[PDB]
Design a protein around this ligand. Structure first.
Ligand SMILES: [Mg+2]
Ligand SMILES: [Mg+2]
Ligand SMILES: [Mg+2]
Ligand SMILES: [Mg+2]
Lengths: 111, 233, 229, 230, 240, 235, 242, 246, 238
């Protein structure tokens, strides 16, 4: 049978300081016991001073990041160029994820 | 939800200083039966892009058709459909990546692994992989199937990192690719002696080579090998 | 229903606007201390219980609106506005921008249902990016921001009086009196607490409809201020 | 008797409902477009209903490299620019490709066309000026609700458009050469828009400006930011 | 009441009447006759414009291997009827395992026309269709349908502006001959008869480019070339 | 389906008008039963009156209707009424109360009144039925979707004439045989024809048989009408 | 008003909405096609409304698939709608049958679609007349399609305001070249005929556009005539107009 | 076009049904006579030209092996109703009960189809009147007339179209409840002679009977419970035989 | 197909003409006491020989605590009453509370409004009076809806033919300061007001009393006839 999921490895880490935050990732991408790439970034600047990473099944992670970056674009279009606050990003990401509750994005997301 | 029937094996590729090289053999297997020997799995799109495909051949032929339509449609109402608004390697890839991920999302995949090799109009080498799950990645070398396991190790000895690319000439790169193809014919039971290779160079453009053969094969030592342990004659 | 005149206006939209001119007056004034909305009740009879006349409604804590015209047509707009403000809060953990809410109602308006709406709306609110705001939403699907505006049967007269009286430092209390005043002038009946209704939205307290006792006190204060010259 | 619907030709082969839709433009506040080889500019005088009212927004961003100005029914500009946002968005997501301005043109023409051919619907009642910077440089486009689109060095639409269209028709050789100079293209735009004024001296609320170019993403300038151009 | 296919106080359908009028717009006449074991259709061919490619100007259509059709009416409507009948004849074959007979296809197109007669949103087609074949059950066959939804089979028939003259000419040949067909073995002589009787009744002579001929035999319908038509014209020019 | 400036429904008014030309039908409600009588408009010697049915239809075992208006429109509505009865019986294991069936039919008519752009049915009904809640019941419905209940009523041609007579001769404590008589007399004086014969009549009764405890529906045969004509002195 | 709806036949068997559509065509810019010995050439008249139009930029000839040219006079948007549908129709033929669509086949596809819009009173006919063609497996073909859906094959064809001038010129070519005509020649001849036909419209100045599809000059692909060869033809037309 | 094209006028008339009846009025005359052991339906085969083939047109059609129909008014309208009627005899009846419907119920269904065309959106009423003759085990022989309104009624004898008025009259004189079928055929032939103008022979006259069971028209032997069709179209030769003995 | 459209003066004619059918409808009135609401309706005169046992009276129960009366097209009213009854049960089912009278009014008003702006439907030829008591509350309730979908509450109100007249009566006779503190003097005011238009009749006037906690009783011909007598006496005593 076709398995719609895979696992591309990697690991991500986020730390909040008083007036900064870091989000870090390794750049390695793997399938089973092979290396696909030694440099395939998976932490992204999303506009409005938000960084995002969606780690696990890279195909799913990419879809989600794409859909969120696009979310931000349309937020500017629909709300007179307003800056998307990090809490508002979070809630929006909840809805992206939950919309797929019965066929989920296999990723751990940090912003 | 399906199963691959007629199949193609490794597609391998690497970037060198002035472009990218991609190769793939000319076989279409039917399980263990080596059924079709004249199968082109490198698909040129314009004068700047080659798309190399492994996996299910029927799905491959579907992807061919899509790429020909992509060219036709791009020319519609486009005076510069072949200048500035000509199709780029990046565009062809993002198109296929999208399709692949949509098809897996509908539980009906195109049973393939695809490498898109080419040169962008600003001279940048383009090399990126996408498969039946919609997973995509880029590297200075890329290979699918057995190529992943055997060709990558050999090709990475020429280009281990990004900074190695300006150091690598067409001659060195083509030599590495030809050698890896020999190894694959040694160790891949679904491989073939005949293959195709294509170079896309920012100066020379696209050179497409058909009917190559693996040559300079070491078999001679076989005569000395008798039995499986104790047998002397 | 979707026909152009040779002047390039939409018959049904223009006639819709005529229906609005037949409606009770509604006035809004936007200050830096709040935005005031006032309306003319216009009971068709003394037996009608005037407190059952809902022509100023809450949309969200930070957004109110007054209507004028065929007011029955406004239920589905108010509903749509409420849903849109609440949904936005659900999807984004924040208050909808006033302009965005107005745009959404205007979007609904565009959707030519057999005919246009026979009602105009004054949408007043506050938000952090653009402060206090007033909007007029026509059944055309167009909306306009105003420092001050009046809609319904007394509008032409009222708009002129608003032209005179409005300045960019009107206190909220000043503005309330102005609404009462201009309503007193344009209403057929004598303005009292039972046939006129005041409301405001302040950042600190949101949208509040004034109760009759609080409105009466303002009517009284208005009469006394005018009997000086 | 022939102006009932768009599904009807007159005996002389005219479509009156389309012609009448074209008329709604002539009531729209004036707007001007013009381009050199490195930039494209929109200048749109906004109209106010009352002296207490906004001078309604006439410029809508479509992508980082594309946008438009409207004259006529604002709701219709919203339907069409929205469709343009989607179409530009689709080009990015699916092909990683910025949408060609010409290609936007053909898409609008086709959207407008359908509305000139089926019962129950009505032609769009808004004219649009479309600027963009793409892979072949700067571009200005004029859209008419009839579904006709044209590529121009400069133009104007709305009330008394003819004044600015005349000024630009002569200034052609002066502005087409304003390469690498942004502020001087906006100047030329503003200098063009006034040849169609009558009402007054264009004020800090009167004016709306939009620029896109070589290293300039499409940005709208309003108020305090446009003061230096009056 | 004169725009859509509702009844008029006299119980009439003006649109259908007007559709019959349109069938004459091209100012062409056709005729069909039956041989012993063939069926022939002749139609005038008029290429006014010198700019036209004459080979593309035709009003005869191969519907299936065995069935041909000639239309009297404007070409857009004629082609629309040809496509539908082609489509219909292929379907019949797939669903039923034998070739659609000529009269069944006639009946089917008739019923389609009848619908435009009855439903307001569809105008009738301004055409008359003559279907010809050698049927495997019935023999040489001619069936003709009009915009009313009417159809019937004919011994012979004619259609167009001078319909009536051709028809009576033909009735007259049959009164005398006492048979219901052209008693000739080869299709070449049946075509020759058909042309002769069209000459005798239009008061006109034909060159090779003024006609169009379709023949139906057992298991084939074909149209003649200008050259085969010339050979026909030569042979009549030794009788008449 | 539109309003006049006066607040009337064009197509409905015009449908009532259509009905006013249809053969007359009369319903009379007795103490121990109900009579249905109806006059066949347009007859001939050759029209087969034996195996015929055009104005009196069985809906159910406990309910019958008399029709004035377009016969074919009526069959449509009779058929859906028969089905509604059966759905009720399937659902509840009880025969449908007369009112409920009548309300349903009226609702269907009202529909054409208010939406869809289709012409109303050109039909009025008299309903005769029995149920265990209200016993004997007489109802009437017309194209407006309106329904009302009656002690006696008439529909179709000459209702003003027939109505006056019934009002004149009806009494609450009547018996079924008298109602049969009253029905025939009333049709006898409102006929647009020479004299009332058997071949121009349909006749039905609903009676709670004295020997049993259950209700019987009788649709009179041609010979049975002919007979009931002699007794009452119309020969 | 036997004209207030489409699917209505007038009492003389004509369709009144179609015949008004023709008026809109006659009202349009003139365009032509010339069949040559192994190809087809297309040309059109582009009215320079104003100095501000960017020259060579508002292209009006359109390719369908890779081997078919389309040009039209009338309501430009109606022409585009038709070409879009022509393209869907060509894709669906290729997808199913592999071979690119034969010109006769493509002609009937448009025919039928156009004809459909003369059948229902809720749709209006197309306000264009379209000239199109190309090279398929057996020859070059040229067609013209009228708002009724009527189409035929042509040696030469013209539509729009300058149509009779053009039609006369074309007739002179047909008569004086029974032998045939080279793609190269037809290109110049097209340029001439457009210039000549611009006389029935000589108020606004105009820009010329030509395209062609020839077996030996383009391998049987549709291409626009550009630079050198375009200028050569503009020159040839300028010369032989005096 | 989703609204009814047949509406009520202020006089309460339904215009389109009236106009349909007028079209029926212009139609060629057709008749039916019910005997004690049969029913006969008959009409004239108005050849539009002598080149047309008379036989190739069914004016009298078999609906089921025991039910026939004939018409007056618009031929093409009739032809689609015959098709829809045959199909409904199967979908609404034989596929449910494994026997063909009784005459009155088939007639009922046809009437339904015609009523619907009187009321559905975008359509005009059928411009025909049908005479439907048949037999079934429980009702015996019957004859019914169906009109554009969807109204139907049973007749002992009747006639429709052009010369109906006179023919109804002529039948009224000749009909008794004791007629044998051969007598009804003869009477039918007489009535038809009055309405017809030109030639009057077996090739201008179409007649069918609903009579006894015809075992030799069955197609197979073996099942004695099946006896075969009661409907029979008379041949051109069979009509002429009865004409010479006028 | 849009039937309810605007006219140049800004009027929806179909909505307007619907009001005319209400005007043509038999009269209905409601007045609300200190602890009651009373509803009264006149009876028609097209024919008389009817069976009153079975024929639907003019006041419909919606839930056990809410009633609805109407003037206008009888057939249109059934449809609104059905939908109201369905909503009443649906509100209980999802909110575990019966409808407030105001909520049931807003619902019905909404339905009427909806039919003023949908293709292919004509507005309701109906105006309603809707009366009752909120659950666990004693303050009386009375509301009016009209074909446009407007609604509001009334100390007292009348609709239908000659409502013009009877509104005049109530406007001077109903004292807001002193609502008819008895069920009795509430029926009295309701009978007086109907008498002005009815032209004497016991089988003409019908009355229904609604008290708190689902207490709703129809009166009898004779029970009303008692009020008929005492009112015609006190007027003839002057
Ligand atoms: Mg926020
Ligand atoms: Mg029709
Ligand atoms: Mg039509
Ligand atoms: Mg011409």
């Amino acid at each position: 049978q076709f398995n719609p999921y895979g696992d591309n490895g990697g690991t991500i880490l986020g730390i909040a300081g008083e007036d900064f935050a870091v989000l870090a990732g390794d750049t390695r991408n793997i399938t089973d016991y092979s290396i696909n790439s030694r440099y395939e970034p998976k932490v992204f600047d999303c506009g409005d001073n938000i960084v995002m990473s969606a780690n696990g099944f890279a195909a799913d992670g990419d879809a989600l990041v794409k859909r969120f970056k696009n979310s931000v674009k349309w937020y500017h279009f629909d709300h007179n160029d307003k800056k998307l606050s990090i809490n508002s990003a979070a809630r929006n990401i909840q809805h992206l994820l939950y919309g797929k509750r019965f066929f989920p994005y296999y990723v751990h997301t940090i912003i | 939800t399906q199963q691959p029937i007629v199949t193609g094996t490794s597609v391998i590729s690497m970037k060198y200083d002035n472009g990218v090289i991609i190769a793939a053999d000319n076989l279409g297997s039917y399980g263990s039966l080596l059924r079709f020997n004249g199968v082109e799995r490198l698909i040129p799109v314009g004068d700047n892009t080659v798309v190399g495909i492994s996996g299910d051949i029927s799905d491959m032929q579907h992807i061919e058709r899509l790429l020909k339509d992509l060219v036709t449609e791009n020319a519609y109402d486009n005076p510069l459909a072949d200048a500035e608004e000509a199709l780029e390697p990046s565009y062809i890839f993002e198109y296929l990546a999208t399709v692949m991920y949509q098809r897996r999302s509908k539980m009906n995949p195109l049973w393939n692994a695809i490498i898109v090799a080419g040169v962008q109009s600003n001279g940048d080498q383009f090399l990126r992989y996408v498969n039946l799950l919609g997973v995509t990645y880029s590297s200075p070398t890329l290979a699918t199937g057995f190529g992943a396991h055997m060709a990558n190790p050999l090709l990475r000895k020429v280009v281990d990192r990004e900074s190695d690319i300006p150091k690598t000439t067409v001659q060195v790169a083509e030599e590495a690719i030809v050698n890896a193809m020999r190894v694959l014919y040694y160790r891949d039971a679904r491989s073939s002696r005949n293959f195709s290779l294509a170079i896309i160079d920012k100066n020379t453009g696209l050179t497409f080579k058909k009917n190559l053969q693996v040559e300079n094969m070491k078999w001679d030592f076989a005569k000395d090998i008798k039995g499986y342990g104790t047998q002397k004659i | 229903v979707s026909t152009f005149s040779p002047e390039g206006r939409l018959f049904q939209v223009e006639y819709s606007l005529e229906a609005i001119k037949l409606g009770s007056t509604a006035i809004g004034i936007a200050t830096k201390e709040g935005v005031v909305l006032g309306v003319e009740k216009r009971a068709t009879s003394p037996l009608l219980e005037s407190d059952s006349i809902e022509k100023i409604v809450e949309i969200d804590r930070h957004i109110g609106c007054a209507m004028s015209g065929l007011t029955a047509d406004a239920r589905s707009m108010i509903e749509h506005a409420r849903t849109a403000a609440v949904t936005h809060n659900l999807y984004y953990d924040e208050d909808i921008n006033v302009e965005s809410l107005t745009q959404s109602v205007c979007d609904l308006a565009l959707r030519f249902m057999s005919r246009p709406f026979g009602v105009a709306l004054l949408i007043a609110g506050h938000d952090a990016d653009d402060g206090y705001q007033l909007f007029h939403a026509e059944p055309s699907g167009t909306f306009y921001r105003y420092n001050a505006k009046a809609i319904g049967s007394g509008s032409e007269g009222a708009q002129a009086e608003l032209l005179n009286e409005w300045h960019s430092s009107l206190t909220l209390k000043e503005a309330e009196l102005l609404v009462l005043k201009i309503l007193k002038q344009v209403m057929e009946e004598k303005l009292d607490e039972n046939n006129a209704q005041l409301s405001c939205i302040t950042k600190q307290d949101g949208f509040k409809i004034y109760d009759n006792e609080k409105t009466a006190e303002l009517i009284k204060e208005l009469k006394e201020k005018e009997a000086a010259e | 008797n022939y102006d009932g619907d768009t599904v009807t030709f007159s005996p002389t082969g005219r479509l009156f409902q389309v012609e009448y839709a074209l008329e709604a433009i002539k009531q729209g506040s004036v707007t001007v477009g013009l381009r050199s080889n490195t930039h494209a500019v929109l200048v749109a005088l906004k109209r106010n209903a009352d002296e207490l009212s906004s001078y309604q927004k006439k410029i809508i961003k479509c992508d980082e490299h594309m946008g438009l100005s409207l004259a006529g029914l604002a709701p219709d500009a919203r339907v069409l620019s929205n469709y343009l946002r989607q179409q530009c968005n689709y080009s990015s997501l699916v092909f990683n490709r910025k949408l060609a301005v010409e290609r936007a043109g053909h898409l609008l023409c086709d959207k407008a066309q359908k509305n000139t051919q089926s019962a129950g619907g009505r032609p769009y009642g808004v004219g649009l000026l479309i600027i963009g910077y793409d892979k072949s440089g700067a571009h200005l486009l004029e859209f008419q609700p009839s579904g006709n689109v044209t590529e121009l060095y400069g133009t104007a639409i709305g009330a008394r458009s003819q004044g600015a269209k005349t000024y630009l028709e002569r200034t052609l050789d002066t502005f087409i050469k304003i390469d690498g100079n942004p502020d001087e293209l906006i100047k030329a735009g503003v200098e063009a828009i006034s040849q169609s004024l009558r009402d007054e001296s264009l004020t800090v609320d009167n004016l709306s400006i939009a620029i896109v170019g070589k290293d300039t993403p499409f940005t709208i300038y309003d108020g305090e930011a446009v003061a230096k151009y009056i | 009441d004169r725009h859509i296919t509702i009844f008029s106080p006299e119980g009439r359908l003006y649109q259908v009447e007007y559709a019959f009028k349109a069938t004459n717009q091209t100012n062409i006449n056709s005729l069909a006759v039956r041989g012993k074991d063939c069926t022939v259709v002749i139609s005038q061919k008029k290429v006014p414009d010198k700019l036209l490619d004459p080979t593309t100007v035709s009003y005869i259509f191969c519907i299936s291997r065995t069935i041909g059709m000639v239309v009297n009416g404007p070409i857009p409507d004629a082609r629309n009827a040809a496509l539908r009948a082609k489509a219909e004849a292929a379907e019949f074959r797939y669903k039923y395992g034998y070739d659609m007979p000529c009269d069944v296809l006639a009946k089917r197109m008739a019923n389609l026309s009848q619908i435009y007669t009855q439903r307001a949103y569809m105008r009738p087609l301004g055409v008359i269709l003559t279907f010809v074949s050698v049927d495997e059950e019935l023999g040489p066959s001619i069936y003709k349908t009009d915009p009313a939804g009417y159809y019937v089979g004919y011994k012979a028939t004619a259609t167009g502006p001078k319909q009536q003259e051709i028809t009576t000419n033909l009735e007259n040949h049959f009164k005398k001959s006492k048979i219901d067909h052209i008693n000739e073995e080869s299709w070449e002589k049946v075509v020759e008869f058909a042309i002769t009787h069209m000459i005798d009744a239009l008061g006109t002579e034909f060159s090779k480019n003024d006609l169009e001929v379709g023949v139906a035999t057992k298991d084939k319908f074909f149209t003649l070339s200008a050259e085969n038509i010339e050979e026909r014209l030569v042979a009549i020019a030794e009788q008449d | 389906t539109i309003f006049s400036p006066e607040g009337r429904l064009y197509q409905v008014e015009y449908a009532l008008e259509s009905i006013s030309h249809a053969g007359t039908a009369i319903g009379i409600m007795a103490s121990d039963g109900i009579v249905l009588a109806a006059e066949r408009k347009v007859t001939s010697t050759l029209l087969e009156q034996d195996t015929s049915t055009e104005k009196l239809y069985k809906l159910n075992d406990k309910i019958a209707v008399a029709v004035a208006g377009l016969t074919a429109d009526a069959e449509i509505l009779i058929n859906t009424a028969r089905i509604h009865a059966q759905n009720y019986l399937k659902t509840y294991n009880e025969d449908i109360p007369v009112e409920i069936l009548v309300r349903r039919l009226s609702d269907i008519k009202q529909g054409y009144t208010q939406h869809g752009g289709l012409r109303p049915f050109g039909v009025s009904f008299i309903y005769a039925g029995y149920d265990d809640r209200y016993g004997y019941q007489l109802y009437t419905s017309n194209p407006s979707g309106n329904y009302t209940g009656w002690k006696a009523i008439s529909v179709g041609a000459n209702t003003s004439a027939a109505q006056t007579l019934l009002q004149m001769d009806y009494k609450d404590d009547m018996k079924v045989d008298d109602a049969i008589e009253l029905a025939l007399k009333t049709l006898s004086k409102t006929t647009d024809s020479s004299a009332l014969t058997y071949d121009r009549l349909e006749f039905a009764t609903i009676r709670k048989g004295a020997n049993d405890g259950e209700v019987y529906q009788k649709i009179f045969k041609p010979q049975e009408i002919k007979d009931i004509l002699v007794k009452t002195g119309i020969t | 008003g036997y004209d207030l709806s489409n699917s209505v036949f007038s009492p003389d068997g004509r369709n009144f909405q179609v015949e008004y559509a023709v008026k809109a065509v006659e009202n349009g810019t003139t365009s032509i096609g010339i069949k040559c010995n192994d190809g087809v050439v297309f040309a059109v008249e582009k009215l320079i409304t104003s100095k501000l139009l960017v020259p060579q930029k508002n292209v009006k000839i359109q390719v369908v698939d890779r081997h078919i040219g389309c040009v039209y006079s009338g309501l430009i948007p109606d022409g585009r709608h038709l070409v879009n549908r022509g393209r869907e129709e060509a894709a669906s033929f290729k997808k199913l049958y592999k071979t690119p669509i034969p010109i006769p086949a493509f002609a009937d596809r448009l025919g039928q679609y156009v004809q459909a819009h003369t059948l229902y009173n809720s749709v209006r006919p197309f306000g264009v007349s379209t000239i199109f063609g190309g090279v398929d497996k057996n020859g070059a073909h040229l067609y013209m399609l009228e708002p009724s859906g009527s189409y035929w094959g042509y040696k030469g064809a013209a539509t729009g305001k300058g149509r009779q001038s053009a039609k006369a010129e074309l007739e002179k070519l047909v008569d004086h070249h029974p032998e045939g005509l080279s793609a190269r020649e037809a290109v110049k001849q097209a340029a001439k005929i457009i210039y000549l036909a611009h006389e029935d419209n000589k108020e606004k100045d105009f820009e010329l556009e030509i395209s062609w599809c020839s077996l030996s000059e383009t391998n049987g692909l549709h291409k626009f005539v550009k630079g050198d060869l375009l200028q050569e033809a503009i020159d040839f037309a300028q010369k032989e107009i005096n | 076009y989703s609204f009814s094209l047949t509406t009520f006028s202020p006089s309460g008339k339904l215009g389109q049904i009236d106009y349909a009846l007028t079209a029926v009025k212009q139609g060629v005359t057709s008749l039916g006579i019910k005997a004690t052991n049969g029913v006969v339906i008959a009409t004239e085969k108005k050849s539009s030209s002598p080149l047309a083939m008379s036989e190739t047109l069914s004016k009298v059609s078999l609906l089921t092996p025991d039910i026939g129909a004939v018409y007056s008014g618009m031929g093409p309208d009739y032809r689609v109703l015959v098709d829809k009627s045959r199909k409904v005899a199967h979908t609404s009846y034989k596929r449910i009960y494994g026997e063909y419907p009784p005459t009155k119920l088939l007639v009922s269904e046809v009437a339904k189809i015609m009523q619907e065309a009187t009321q559905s959106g975008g359509v005009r009423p059928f411009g025909v009147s049908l005479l439907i003759a048949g037999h079934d085990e429980f009702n015996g022989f019957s004859l019914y007339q169906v009109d554009p309104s969807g109204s139907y009624f049973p007749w002992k004898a009747t006639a429709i179209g052009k010369g109906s008025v006179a023919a109804k009259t002529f039948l009224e004189k000749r009909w008794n409840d004791e007629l044998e079928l051969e007598d009804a055929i003869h009477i039918a032939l007489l009535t038809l002679k009055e309405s017809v103008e030109g030639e009057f022979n077996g090739d201008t006259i179409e007649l069918a009977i609903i009579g006894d069971e015809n075992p030799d028209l069955l197609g197979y032997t073996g099942i004695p419970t099946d006896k075969g069709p009661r409907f029979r179209k008379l041949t051109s030769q069979e009509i002429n035989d009865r004409l010479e003995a006028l | 197909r849009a039937l309810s459209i605007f006219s140049p003066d800004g009027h929806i004619f179909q909505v307007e003409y619907a009001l005319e059918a209400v005007k043509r409808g038999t009269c209905a009135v409601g007045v609300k006491g200190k602890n009651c609401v009373v509803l009264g309706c006149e009876r028609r005169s097209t024919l008389k020989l009817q069976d009153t046992r079975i024929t639907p009276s003019k006041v419909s129960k919606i839930d056990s605590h809410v009633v609805l009366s109407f003037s206008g097209l009888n057939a249109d009213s059934r449809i609104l009453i059905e939908k109201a009854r369905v909503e009443a049960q649906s509100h209980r089912l999802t909110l575990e509370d019966p409808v407030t009278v105001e909520y049931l009014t807003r619902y019905v008003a909404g339905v009427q409004q909806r039919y003023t702006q949908s293709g292919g439907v004509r507005p309701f030829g109906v105006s309603t009076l809707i009366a009752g008591f909120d659950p666990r509350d004693d303050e009386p309730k009375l509301y009016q809806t009209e074909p446009s979908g407007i609604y509001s509450s009334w100390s007292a109100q009348t609709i239908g033919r000659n409502s013009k007249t009877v509104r005049e009566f109530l406007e001077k006779n109903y004292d807001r300061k002193e609502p008819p503190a008895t069920v009795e003097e509430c029926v009295k005011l309701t009978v007086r007001s109907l008498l002005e238009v009815v032209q004497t009749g016991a089988k003409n006037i019908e009355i229904t009393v609604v008290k708190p906690d689902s207490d709703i009783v129809a009166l009898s011909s004779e029970e009303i006839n008692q009020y008929v007598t005492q009112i015609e006496q006190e007027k003839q005593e002057q």
